[PDB]
Every structure is written in C-alpha cells, then in structure tokens.
Design a protein around this ligand. Sequence first.
Ligand code: YHQ
Ligand code: YHQ
Ligand code: CL
Ligand code: CL
Ligand code: CL
Lengths: 654, 660, 660
Amino acid sequence: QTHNVVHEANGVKLRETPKEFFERQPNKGHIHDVNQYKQMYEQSIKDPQGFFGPLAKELLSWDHDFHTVKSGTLKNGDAAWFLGGELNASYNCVDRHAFANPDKPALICEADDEKDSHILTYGDLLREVSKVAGVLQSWGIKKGDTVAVYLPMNAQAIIAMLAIARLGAAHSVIFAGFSAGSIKDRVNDASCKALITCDEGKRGGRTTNIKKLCDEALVDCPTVEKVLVYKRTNNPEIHLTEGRDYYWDVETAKFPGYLPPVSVNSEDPLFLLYTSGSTGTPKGVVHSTAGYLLGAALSTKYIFDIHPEDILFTAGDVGWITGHTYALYGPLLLGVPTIIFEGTPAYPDYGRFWQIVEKHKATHFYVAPTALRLLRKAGEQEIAKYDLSSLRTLGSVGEPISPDIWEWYNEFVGKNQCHISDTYWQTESGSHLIAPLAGVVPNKPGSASYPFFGIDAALIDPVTGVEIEGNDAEGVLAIKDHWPSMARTVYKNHTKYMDTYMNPYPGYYFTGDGAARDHDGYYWIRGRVDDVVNVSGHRLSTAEIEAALIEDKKVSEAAVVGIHDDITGQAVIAYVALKEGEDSEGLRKELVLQVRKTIGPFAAPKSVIIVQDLPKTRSGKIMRRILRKVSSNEADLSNPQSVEGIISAFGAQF
Amino acid sequence: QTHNVVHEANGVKLRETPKEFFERQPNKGHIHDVNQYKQMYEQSIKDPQGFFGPLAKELLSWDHDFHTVKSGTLKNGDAAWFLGGELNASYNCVDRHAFANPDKPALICEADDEKDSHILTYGDLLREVSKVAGVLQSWGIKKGDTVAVYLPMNAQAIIAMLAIARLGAAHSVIFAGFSAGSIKDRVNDASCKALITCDEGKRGGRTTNIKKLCDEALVDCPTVEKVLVYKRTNNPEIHLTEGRDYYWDVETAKFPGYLPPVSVNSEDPLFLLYTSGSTGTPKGVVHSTAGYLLGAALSTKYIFDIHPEDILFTAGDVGWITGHTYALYGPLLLGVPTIIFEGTPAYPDYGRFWQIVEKHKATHFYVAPTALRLLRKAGEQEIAKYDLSSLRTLGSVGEPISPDIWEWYNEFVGKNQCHISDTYWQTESGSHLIAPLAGVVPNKPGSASYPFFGIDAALIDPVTGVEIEGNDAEGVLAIKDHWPSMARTVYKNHTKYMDTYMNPYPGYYFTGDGAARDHDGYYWIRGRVDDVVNVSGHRLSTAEIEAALIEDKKVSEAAVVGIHDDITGQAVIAYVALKESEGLRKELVLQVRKTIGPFAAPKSVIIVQDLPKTRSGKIMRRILRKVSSNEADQLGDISTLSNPQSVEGIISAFGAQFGK
Amino acid sequence: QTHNVVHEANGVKLRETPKEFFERQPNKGHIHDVNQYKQMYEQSIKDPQGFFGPLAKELLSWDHDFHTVKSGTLKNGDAAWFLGGELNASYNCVDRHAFANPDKPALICEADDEKDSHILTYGDLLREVSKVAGVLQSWGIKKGDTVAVYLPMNAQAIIAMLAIARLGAAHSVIFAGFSAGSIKDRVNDASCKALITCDEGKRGGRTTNIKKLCDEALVDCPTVEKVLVYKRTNNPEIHLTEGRDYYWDVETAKFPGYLPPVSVNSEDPLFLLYTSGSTGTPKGVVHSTAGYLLGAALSTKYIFDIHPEDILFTAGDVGWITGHTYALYGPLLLGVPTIIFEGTPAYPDYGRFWQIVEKHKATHFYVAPTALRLLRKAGEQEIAKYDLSSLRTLGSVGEPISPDIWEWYNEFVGKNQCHISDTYWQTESGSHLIAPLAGVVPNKPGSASYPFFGIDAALIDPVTGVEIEGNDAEGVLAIKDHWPSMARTVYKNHTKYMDTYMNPYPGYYFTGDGAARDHDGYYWIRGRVDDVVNVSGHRLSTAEIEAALIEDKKVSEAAVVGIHDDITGQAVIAYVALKEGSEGLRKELVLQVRKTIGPFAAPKSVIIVQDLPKTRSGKIMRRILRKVSSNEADQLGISTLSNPQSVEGIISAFGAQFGK
Ligand SMILES: CC(C)OP(=O)(O)OC[C@H]1O[C@@H](n2cnc3c(N)ncnc32)[C@H](O)[C@@H]1O
Ligand SMILES: CC(C)OP(=O)(O)OC[C@H]1O[C@@H](n2cnc3c(N)ncnc32)[C@H](O)[C@@H]1O
Ligand SMILES: [Cl-]
Ligand SMILES: [Cl-]
Ligand SMILES: [Cl-]
C-alpha cells in the first residue's frame, strides 16, 4: 500500500469517471469497464492477428485486402502491418463520409478573427481536396513524391495534406513558426517537388510573413518546381516568382470537384514530420499509411470515446504530430467534425477557447498544459461566461500535467463532470501509447495510467539494461514489440533510426523518456532522459539551438540547458562563450535573434548568458548539470574557477 | 389533340415500327414495348443506383469492382459514376471479344478505293493495338499523358485510339479536315507528348496532305517528342524529321502481338475531343472511362437494337463524337463488327453507301441528314441497284431531320420496312440523350421522341429561368441531373465548363438547344439557342469563323450567322466590313479554310460598309439572319439599332454579292 | 524392337528408379507411376485451361486473379498466359515464405573459400532484398525499367535479381565471365538505367577484376545513371566514379528491412537474358512473369520431385538460364533452401562439390556433364571420402550426356541408388521441355525421355518441312503449341524473334535442335542444327567469335568452328587469314576474343591459314573445317569450292599449328 520508489503515487486516490460523462454519452460506450479493457489489451498483446485484423477491416476501408496482419521484429527494424493491403487516406478521411452524408460538417474552421470563420462539410471537403490534388497532379506530382506544406493551422492546411495523400505522395508539413533556415533543411532533405503555402498569416491579430520566408528558403531548394500560394490576406504587395509560384484560387478553378484517389500499399509512406532529437539536425520521421491510420482511428475512438454524434476540438497545430493525428486523421477517419482553430487562446480575449466550445457545442477538448497554465493565470474569469456543458472528455498532451493543473482543469473547465485523459505519446509513436480511456480507466492526477492496445510497456534499468520485473519501479520507458502506428524509419537514414530507437536496448523500442510504474500498474512519466527540452509543448533539441548560436561567427562554443518554467513548463537557457575580437547587453540580443532566424521565434532562448568560458570537464566536454543548477538558482573540472563566473554572469544578465 | 405552342405536332400520325423489322431481328428484342421502357426509364431516374449498378456489371468488364454507383451534383460540377471501379477501354472493346471468338470480324475497313478494303478480326485488332501500344509505351507514354491522332476515317485511326487508351493515356483525335492552325491549337492545349498520323490521305479519289500539315503545325508544338507515321500511300517524297518521326510498320514490327492493358479508374479521362462553342476558342471536352463506355454500350444496345449477330455501319468520322461513340466504342464494346468507311458517298458513284451495305449485309445504318439530302439530289436512282434487305434500323444524327427527308429516308432506303431513330445528343453528352428506341418507341417524323435511360429532360422558360410544367410547351432544353456518359470537365479549364453548362441555369445542365414537348411527351428539337451553326453536320462556332476572317488584316469587323440551306441543312453567311471585289471575297473564304479548315468555309461572304449594331454596341445578328433568308421586309424590329441606316447597305450587298 | 533410324536406342534396357529413391522420399511422390503422368500430360495438351488453371492458383500467389488461362498462337507470336492476373516474383520467392517460417534457410551461400560461407533465412532474404529495392527505388528505378547485374554466383547476385523484380523492373543478368565488350552490348541494348556489381571476385582462389571491366564498358553506356558496388574483397584500390558509383553496404544501410512489392501483370517482363544464336549479335530473350514462374515451380516440383523438406544444389551460374530457373526461382518458389556456390568444383580440391552436399545434406544435385567429365578425370578418388547418401535426384543439363558418363554419374555419385534426370531445355523455353520425371519415368542412358507438361514435342523433316508421323524417326525438334514459360519476344526486336522461332516452320516453335524419337517415344537430342557451339554447356555463336577476331584489323577473314573436346564436350577452333602480318600473333587473337566477349569464349586453338575454303558466292565452307579439325579431312562429302587448293593448306596448317 506504500511506495518506496514511485513517490508520486503515495496517497493518490483513484478518481472515478463522473456520472455526468455517461449521461452525456450519445450511445453505449465502446468499452464497458476496466475488466473488459484488460482482456482486450491482453489480446492485443498475445494475439495481435486476432485483435487488429478484425479492427482493421472494421475501421478502415480497403482498396485491396491484406493477407498478413503483422510482420518483422523490433530488433531487425523491419516492422510492417497489414501487408498486401491497399487503401488511400483521403478516401478514408473524406470520400467515404461524403458519399454517406455529404452535408455533415467536416472542418469547423474558426479563424483568428471570428468574422472569417466558416464550416466545410464532407462534400465541400471532397471537392476542395479533389481540386488541389488536380492541380498537383497536373504539375507532375505522382506517387512516391513528397510535397512540403508551410501553412498556419487553418482549413487550407488540412486540405493541402489530404490532397497530397490523395495522389499517393507524402506530405511534409512545416510548422508555420519555423524560419527560412528550418524550411530549407526540411525541404531539401525530402527533395520536395512542390510547396503549398500562403501569402501572409493571421495569428493573435498580428500579420506574419509567410511567403517571404518561403522565397527566402527556396533559393537553396532546387527540387521545388512549383509553389501553390493561398490568398489568406490578399495583400497586393506579396511578390510571386514568375514561372514558379501560382495562386490557389486561380489553379483550383481549372479542375473539377472530384479526382480519383490513388491506391497505395499499407506500408507506403503517408507523411514525413521532422522532429528534433538529441541529433543537432532534425530527422524526418516517416509513418506508414494503414498502420498509422488504424492507430489514429483506434486511439481516438477508444481513448477519447468518440462517437458519430461527437465534435472534437484539438487545440493544436498540424505542424506537430498532435495536429496530424488528433486534429486531422483521428476525427476525420471516424467521420466526426473537427474544429480547426487558427488563432490563439488570448485573442480577442482569454475566453476564446470557451466561446468556440460553446459556439459549436464541442464534446471533446484536447490541449497542452501550457495553455491551462496561461489560462489559469489570466483567464479564470472568462470561463464562467460560457456554457461548457456539452464537453465530457478533456485531454492533455505534450507535457507532464501537474496534479494541481489536473485539479484546476477538472474543476474550472470540466466542472467535476468530465473525464480527463492525460495522453502520453510521441511523434515516432503515431498515436497514443499510454492514456486513461474515457469512461473506462479511473484517473490518478498526473498519471497516464495503462498502456493502450498493442503497447507492451516496460521499464529498463538504465545501468544494467535489463527489464525491471515487478511494480513500484522506475527506469527508462521501453516498448517490447512494435505497434501498428509506430514510425517505420528516418527518411533515408534508417541507421540513425536503428541507433536511436532499436539499438540502445536491443529487443525494445527506446522512447527517450523516463517513467515509473506503481503498485496499481499506472505509469508516471518522469521526462526525457536525453538532451531534449519541452518548451511550451514543442519538442526542442538543445543541440539544435546550440548549432544555431554557432552560426553567429562571433561564438566559439555554446551550451544550452533546460530549466523549470512555471508557464512554459520548461525553458531554455543558453550559455555562450565568445572568441576574441563591445556592448555585452547588445550582443546577448544578437544571439537571441540568431536563433529566431535559424530555427524560429518559438525556439528563442528565454535568456542568453554570456560567459568567459564554459564549465568543461577534465576531458573537455560541457557538463550541462552545472549550468542547470546555476540557472535554476540551485548552484549548491578542468576549470573549476569558471563556475564562480558562471553564477555572476547569470546573476547580472538574467 | 391540338397544339397552340408545338405546331410541329399538329396532325402527325404515330409511325409504328414495320413488321419486317421484327422479322429481321436475330433474337428476342431487348425491350418489348413502351410500357416496359417507361418502367425501366422510371427506375433510371428515381433509382439510378438500382438501375445502372447491375447494367454496369453486365455490359462492362471490371478490373476492380466499384463501391458507389453515383456521386456529385450538377450544380457543384463534381459528377462521378462507378466510383472505386477500375477497368480498361481497350480490354472491353478488344481483348474480351478476342478471347471468346478471335476470328469474329471487328473492323470492316472499306477504303476509298474498294481494292484497298479489308477486314480485321478481333484477334487481328488485339495484335495491332498491342503493337501500337508497345511502341507508344517504349516512347514513354504512360497513364495521364495525352496522345494526338490526326488520321482519316480508316482502320489505323481506330487502332491508334485503342492503343492510346490501352496504356491509360487519353487520345485527342483531330479531324483530318482541320488545318495546321487547328492542329497547332489542339496539340498545345493538351500538351501532347506524341502524335499518330499518316503520310497522305485518300478521300474521294483525291490525295490529301496529312503529314505535310502536321509538320507545319509541329514547329510550334514543343511538347510532341515523337510522331508515328503510317504509310497510307507510301509516297517516297514525304519527309520525316530525323529523331522525331518514325514509321508505323517499322516500329510495330519490333514489338509482340500482346501487351497487358493498364487499369484506370472509372473517372480517369478516356479521351479529349475539342468542340466548338459560343466561346471563340475550341475547348477540350473530357469524358470519363466507365461512365462514357456504359453510355456508349447502353445506347447502342437499346436505341439501335444491336445484337451479337448484327453489323453496324456508322457513316461518320472519328474526328467527331459520332465516330467516337457509335463507330468505335458502341459497337466494339458489344462485340459486333463495325464498318469503317474511308471515302465519300459519291466515290466512285452515289451508290457507294448501298454497295457497302449490300457487300457486308449490314443491319444498321447511321448517317447525317446532310448525306440524305445530297443522295436525294444526285443518287436516288442508284439506291434501287442494291440489295438493302439486311437493314432494319436506320439512324439520323447531328441535324434536325425534316419530315420530307424522314419520308424519303424511310421509303427509298428503308423500303417502308425499317425503324428510323432520330438520335439527339451532343459531344458533351457522350451518348444519346433523346431518341426513339428501335422496335419500341413509335415515331413522329422529325421528332426525337422520349428521353433515354438516366436523362431527366426538362424545358426552361428562357426569360424567367423556371422549369416549365406541363406539355405543349417550348423553351431551353435542360437535364435535371448528371448521367453516366456526361462530359466531366473542359481540359484544364473547369471554370469554362461550369460557366457553359451548369451555371446558366443552376441545378440543370444547359444543352444550348431550344426544344418543344407536345401532348404525347415527344421532344421536338428546335435548334441551337446560342452562336453555334451546324454546317454540314459539323458543329461550328460563329465566333471562330468571325475570328478567322478578322485575322485577314484587311477586315475591321465580322459577323457570321447561320441560315437554312437546302443541301447542307444550314449554311454560314459572313458579313465583313473592311478598313478601306470578287477577289477579296475569295481571299476571305480561303482565310477560313487555312485557319479552321476547308470544311468550315462560308457559303458566301458579303462585303458591307458597316454592320447593324445594337444600342449597347453588339452586332444585331437577327437582322443579318433575316436579310440572308430573304425576309428583309418583315424585319421584326430595327428600332434597337444605333445605325438604322446600315440596314439599307446590308440588304443591297446581300442581293448583289450572294449570286456572284 | 529394332531401330533403323534411332541407332542410339538399339539394345538399351530401361533403367528403373532405384528403391532407395522411394525410401528417401519424405512423403508420397507427387506422381505415382508413368500411367498417371501419361494422363496428366494428355490433359496439359488437350485441356491446357483445365490443367494449368488450377496449378497456377495452387503454386503461385496472386495479387489479382486471372480470367483467361491461355491466349495467342505460335504462328502469330502473341502467346500469353494467365491474362488479367497480377503478382510479384519476389513475394512468391521470398515474402510468403518469410511470413510462414522467417527462420527457414533460403540461400545456402557456399563461398569460394569456405571460411566466408553463410546462410540467409527467408526472413534475412526479405530484409536484404527490401533494402536493395529501397536503394533502387530511390534512384528512380520504377516499373518498366531494366537494371543490369554483373556479379559472380553468390548471394548478392540472387539478392540483386530479386530486388529488381520487387520493383516491377526487369533484371538483365550479365555472366561474370564476359568482358567489357559483351557488357557494353547488353547494357546499351536494354537501355539500363542502373547497374549492380562488385569491386572484385573470388573464384578458384584467384581474384577477378569485376569493377574494372564495368568501368571499361560504362564509358560507352550513356543510359546507366548510377552503379551499386558490393564490397566482395574490400580492395581499397578499386576506383568509384563520383556521382555514378555507390557502395552496396552504405546505401542499403539507409533503408528499412521491408519495402512493399510492386504488382505486375502476368505478361509483364520478369527479366532479360541475352543468348547467342546464329546471328552475330546477342539477342535479348524476354520472359514473362507468371508464365515463367509457373514453369519454374512446376518443373522443379515434378521433374526433380522437390518436397518442402528437400535441399537443392544447382551447380550453375545465374549468368545463364540454368541459374535463373533452378538455382533461384524454382527452389525459392517452392520454399526450399537452394545452395549458392561461388567457386569451382576443383578449389580447394576436387571433392568440393561433395563436401558441400554432405555439409548441408543436399537431397538434389544438378550439374552439367562437363563437370562430371572433369571430376571423372581428376577427382574420382575424392567422391568416396564424403557421405552422399542424402542425395536421391541427380540432374544433367546443357549438354548431351554420353551413356558412359551417365553410368559414371549414376554409380560413383548416386551409388546406383538415385534417379538421373537428363533435362533438355533452352534459354527460350524458360524451364524443362523433355526430362525424365524423378521416381516416375525409367531412364535410357543418354536420352531425355518424354516431353513435360504442356510441351507437345514433334519432329519435322528438314527437307519437306512436314511433321513426321510415327516413331523410329529423326528430324528437327519442334513444339506444336506455346507453353507457359516460353520466351515471349526478343527485346525491341520481335521480328528477329519471329524469324528465329516461329517463321522457319510456321505453326511450330523451332528449337534449333535435331532429335530422334524411338519406338518407345523417348527423345534422343542430336544437337544444334545451326552455327551454335556448346563449349562447356555455355551456348556460343561462331559468328560472335568471328566478329571479335575481325575487329583486329590485322585479320582479313576468320572462320570459327566447333570440334569435339573430351572435357568441355565441344571446343572452338578459329581459322584466321591475315593480310600482311607467328606464335605471338596467335596469342594476340586469342586475347582479342578475351577482350571482346570474354575469356571463356576464347578459341581453343587459332590456326593461321593463307586463305579459307570459300564458295563461289563468297561463303566459308564450314563443314570442311569441322571435318579437317576432327582429323576427318578425307570424308569431306564439295561442289561449291572455288579454291579446292586451299583445302591442302588448311590440312597442313592444322596438323602443324594445333600443337604449338
Ligand atoms: C451529335 C454530335 C455530332 O453533335 P455535336 O457536334 O456535339 O453538336 C450538338 C448539336 O447538334 C444538334 N443535333 C444533334 N443531333 C440532333 C438531332 N437528332 N436533331 C436535331 N439537332 C441535333 C443540336 O444542335 C445539338 O446541340
Ligand atoms: C539449358 C541452357 C543452358 O541451354 P542454353 O544455354 O539456352 O542452350 C540451349 C541448347 O543447349 C543444348 N542442350 C540443353 N540441354 C541439353 C540436354 N539435356 N541434352 C543435350 N543438349 C542440351 C541444346 O542444343 C539446346 O538447344
Ligand atoms: Cl486476414
Ligand atoms: Cl455496389
Ligand atoms: Cl479460371
């Protein structure tokens, strides 16, 4: 009854699913109780063929039937699911629903200014997707090509992604907050033949330069042959390169409202999504089609308890896996409307999220703890102004959610009447790994609870490398076998894929996360064990930010570390040592701007600390732990004298 | 029994199908009576999924089954049929028949000179199509490409179209009567990668310059990488560009007699066919595969009453939709022989058609009224010299058929023993829209009778735009929902497609024709309500002929209108205003022959000082039509003219110059 | 009981299958006796659709079902099998077995040095093939492309062929014994986009220059865009051209262990294999996919009596059809392990073959008579040192096997306990044509016995061209209808295909071989009737060797003929007439052939003469040269001799120069 290792679980009462949840449920739940889930989970692990086989035939529409459910091993890096099958993601996300009820809402597009909001039905979505795919097809985009998308979180982003997939091409979405440097690396790694973007962006009421950043990147992108440009603001001063750039509205008007979808294999790549690891250069994560789609449909249906009558509002961005899986593919596969919100939770006020939920009577809400911390700070009064009684499932993602934020989230938003789903997963996992199923799994505030279907979670002693038997344990979180939506490779760098996920603990998948398992079997995520920082739910690499600082030729060496931040959860502090050859305060700001243009404004360090030399080991490498403690005011060795200078530089410049 | 609006229907007795028709039928008819047709028609309109679903699985062979029969709406321009299905037109037209009876005749090629006539069995056609597709495939022609065909109406034209479609590419046939300019425009719009043509042509005994006109156009066609040239006359003086042009016989000898067909989606384009509308620039009409093929097979089977034992002789050209649907796809889909005639109805004599029918015992004849009027003038005596007792279905297409031509066609050709099927349809419709089913629907000479399966015809008041309820009515002819073989878009210009067909009357498909519906429900086609003239059965735009005359820099403005002609049915008179006499008229007529082609030349060019223009500024063509039709005394209204003095000059110029 | 024509058959007792064979069979045989085979053969000939239809569904896994079993005729050259079907060769040879037993042995790779031997399971093979196919796909290699392979007989050669086929591309394997000249002709004829090779080879303990020969040819190969190089020896002195050449291990490491296979049509080309005929230029023989694969599985299963528990050791090379069909496709289709041997039967000793058989308990052995003659001469004592009791089927291929070698093979290798299968077939047949089924057909030493399923063998009188009725007859060996694995065309040269195989005797397939049929129906292969020489089982063209000698401009004319050799069966003698040009020059010409074709095609002896026996027209009397070389220069049979005095110079030159 007492835990010696998993201290989070001591004195934590199980929080049942409120009765109001089952009152608001439109139909019978998909799973009755935890016991039924236990048996379903056991079958998903002991008998994947008998479990996912029928579920694949049920939830997905196939152009060609598969003959083998599961193939390959984790250790050999040859995992494959539903081999021999053929299908198309846009048909499963659009066509099959449009043919049934073409007037059912599909994309609920809430623009930055609500005066620009609109709704696309599945019939509308089919025609728009078909037109964009018709444009791309006429440009030579064929199966096996990759098409980059640099768009904000609006309806055009969803249309672009589905139009690319309709042709059998893989879309590589680039988060609109990246700079020309990040756009350049991603476009050239995938050798994209085309790019879809817009003239300008509207977020928080402020206009962003989108097309100018594209033009800036495309001078080093010889593979991009044509660019489709959407008139978001219709600014007449935005220049289009003659012979390369063409207008969305102009080109789509030349093509009809239906284009046949292209059948692809189950294991044909659906999309690339470049993620940051302890790598220095972002690596292109590649996901299959059938495996990924099932994971999106399966998790969305069961973890969130999504029914045909439901409305899902994932407050995320398609530039990250959360927008991919649970704003686009998850809900559209199940045929339900999905709310696509372009702006911020603060514009025009801090009741923007709740006005949207009330406006469309959304039944499911999915956001990162960073927004909850902000809205607790500056938006508690706005929540009571709106009717949130349509909600019954509330989800958290991207970051650890403190028990206190869990309570605030449950009370002030859920009114002690909704189920909270702390969903743990990764870009590489495609869909949820560990999460409490809505209406099934009781909560422990701050825990993700039980693994999901097909995930045989395990803890590994980092020192010995041996799987830890028994509960009340801590260690590195690993998966003992591959699952349908697991990422299949790193684009054209499968050795890096193997070295990162399969080789560190042979026979297992290495998540890069630490976690603990208590006597009840619940998993408590501890955080990353590598050089990855979670700034406001956005995965960042300390190595990537350091390399950005090094691009400024005024820097000799740089060291970036992550510290606790009470709003962004975790913040990046950059320690920079300059070479030989004025205005120290002015130079700090130069380095911050250096990161904003190399990676992007969101990856800027909170503070840049200029030092004389960095604390370096006897060998010569940087001990970041000294920087971590000094930065977090916990400052209690080839150069043991520098440590005093580090503390003073931080005390003065911070 | 009396009509106040549909005057054509007054005092017109129903003309039943002669008993000899049912005697000559090889088997039981496909539909018994009008009662069964009414019930089938009702289902095709109220339950398209339950009607066309089974018919598609029956008449067409599928590589992949379809999951949805019908999708999209007319108003949104997203019509789709048999979604999810995969098939191949050449497999449906050739292979499946070659596998059953490889020695059954497929193409009965009657050449211009009968000494060059021959017959291709379905087995022969498979070998030739596979060889031509093997050549094209080796040249890089893959699915999604377009291949142009500039060939006369002979067996090589048919092989090229099927070979292009066998690879999943869309063929764009260019009528052999077009000029280097017309070839140039069509090739560049579709961005064709290859071209199939021949060295020279034989039509009416006269040699035509085929390859020479291609070379003339191809200097401005940068997308065409290779050209396959057939030795029709084997004239050694015909030049081939090294590295670009290759010979049919030389290259096809390099490849085997079977090539796998390429599966395409139901809604993948089968072909482009550039048609003339009231737009000025020819637009590439695009047809799907499964939808179009079914429409061709369904209409050919039911409207013409085609059985496996029958032989069809469509006296048309693959350069137009009539040759597309009812000389190639219609009959070949059903597995029956099709007579491909290369020459003219007058060479070597005016009994050429009837000698062909007698030679092969053709059971079905399909021609335009223009030929009937010509043969009435100079070939009536020849008809009796030949045994035409094998015929039982006689078809008319392209033009309105006058009651007198209907009687002449029934008596001297059909011997008052055949069914006459006046088939109304368009390039954009793919197959028949309104026609009397052979052996089922009684005729009214000059009427097309009832709509066909899946066609919910309607009349719209041009002024109000409201559907006209009830009979004894006239107005714009519209279709209330899309049908399987309806054209799906205009190539790379879907906005023009929408603006032309779907937007004028939202919720409907706008045919561009006026028509009347009588108390019996029969439709009487009145003619085009837009600037389209039917010159010798070939659809033409007055805007194209006007633009052709204006290219001659001696012309300031031009206005072309269509009037009745007793031989060609409708002729174009061109009114030209110069910027400053017989010789200049001859220059302008030749100007049209070089821009469009010899077939589109105006009947007469009338030089005038200035044209009748309205208050707004547009050319009042109705005055030009009336003056040309010798009705320049019942001019309904000239008070709308900014220059009512021009009318005096228009009448005098026409009276003086029309004879000269 | 006595033969007047087939003298080989006189006094030849039927040699029954030893009882130990049926003891060693893992299960009941696939066919019980000759009577059951006779009935099955009758159905394969009288009802191919009912015979091969079910067998195709049984032995092959289909992505799409076929609708027609058989199509086309021999005379029209449009043969096709299993039309409409779709499948993939690598899925049938690798994936479907890896999914069942991923750890079952697939490739038993015996390297030249046994220290480098290893075993790839079906799971291992899927990962290796998937990675190489992933590399090739990234280079743009898509369906319809051809990829050349210049590798020795090791596991990488098998992987390369399967990786190419996985993408829907056709692999064109180039035997590693060719020189840059032969590589050039094959690569440029197929327009290969890529090439898979290695840096150097290990054969007989000697290092071979592989990549150096590629670089020499590739300077004249503009179509090859990239080259994948395998580190066989890891020699750092082997140069790779930057931008074209890439390393096997480096590139495959970038891609995952599974890649989806690409479905192809039954009649989509699986591979090219350039064979030498009486033409002068090697012709690219093209084989279908489904038809070829079925032939490989069917013959391997039934003629060799292959069961799931068996191990096959085909002592051949993938550079020839024997390695294609019965070292790669045959066994892997059936899911059994196949031994891939890189070296020679003499390194490190002449018991190398038998050590391999004992090491892996191989149940089936398949080799050419040339190796048997070599091992009889210098390795007879080694055979008894090894346990060969696991064998039960012994196969002969490529050459006629003398009755004496048949006895030695049966006794010293089979211990008078195994079935001998003298398999007669060709590159163009894909799989066996005439062979004694293991455990079914009794043997006549030196005979191939009865035709196999679907092979309607026949004899044709060369003079009359008429099929020979009755037995005890001799003539040209022909097949009366096409069979599933029959070659479908010559790459981009179907006219040569027709002229070589279908046109000589219309209605039949002309094998190019003479044969005799005795009173029991057994076929006795007599040999090639054209200018083809069988040097050590490798088909060679005399015209190709003559053209190589003529490239040396020191030669005026050359004439190559084949003579009896007691080890290689047949050896090539070259008679060369110089212009103004002795021992050193003979070595120049021998090296000249080694430079154009390859060391294996080098003449055994080069005889310099003043002039060749030439006809009045200008032809070389080759029949005189054959007899003179075989010391039969008195039974010359000679009316066309324009220079009957040259014959004396030919005889003297041969008697003097053949030694030194
Ligand atoms: C068939 C094909 C060659 O037509 P298009 O060249 O696409 O031109 C279509 C136009 O032709 C005219 N029309 C065709 N058929 C008939 C008919 N039976 N009775 C009366 N008018 C007919 C109509 O004006 C139609 O809109
Ligand atoms: C199998 C492969 C290596 O053959 P190719 O290299 O294509 O040459 C084919 C020619 O080889 C000869 N032949 C093959 N098998 C035998 C045999 N069993 N008995 C006698 N002659 C045989 C024949 O002259 C055949 O036409
Ligand atoms: Cl299954
Ligand atoms: Cl259906
Ligand atoms: Cl069958």
